[PDB]
């Protein structure tokens, strides 16, 4: 079952993602391989769906922020993948990510002008009534 596979994935939970995060951290692992691992994370995020990642997805997002920090050649493609992972992710507390989500976004906006704008517009539409709860905080 895809759901049965998801349950096996659930047991690894954040820790399987963390092991990947350690692999991304290691100097020896290839930058392209790390991008592939990030793609693997994006596929996993879609497989969990928004509900499955839950609190763990926010921990994964912190891991994602570390992945965002080392981007180089990998990043313009990677940022699009990260947004796709976010789209697979339930918006959940999009307001809770708030500025911190924006701060990752602001570096991203510099790396590619088009990608950041597309992510922001999608985020603004997704937040809806929830959107702008932290907007005053993100002056």
The backbone torsions φ and ψ at residue 29, rounded to the nearest 5 degrees and listed phi first, read -65, 140
Q: Which two tokens stand for residue 108?
A: 């991203």
H or E element that contains 68 = helix 31-69
Report residue 73 CA to chain centroid gap.
18
The whole-angstrom separation of Cα 43 and Cα 48 is 9
Q: Are 79 and 112 in contact (CB under 8 A)?
A: yes
The technique is cryo-EM
Angstrom resolution of this structure: 6.2
């Amino acid at each position: 079952s895809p759901e049965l596979m998801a349950d096996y994935l659930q047991p690894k939970l954040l820790g399987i993602l963390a092991f990947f995060n350690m692999q991304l951290l290691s100097s020896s692992v290839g930058i392209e391989d790390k991008k592939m691992a990030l793609n693997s994370l994006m596929s996993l995020m879609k497989l969990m769906g928004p509900k499955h990642v839950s609190s763990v997805r926010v921990k994964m997002m912190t891991t994602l922020r570390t992945g965002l920090r080392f981007k180089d050649d990998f990043p313009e493609l990677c940022c699009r993948a990260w947004d796709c992972f976010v789209r697979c992710l339930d918006h959940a507390c999009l307001g809770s990510l708030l500025s911190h989500v924006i701060v990752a976004l602001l570096p991203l906006i510099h790396i590619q002008p088009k990608e950041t704008a597309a992510i922001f517009h999608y985020l603004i539409i997704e937040n809806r009534d929830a959107v702008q709860d932290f907007l005053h905080e993100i002056y």
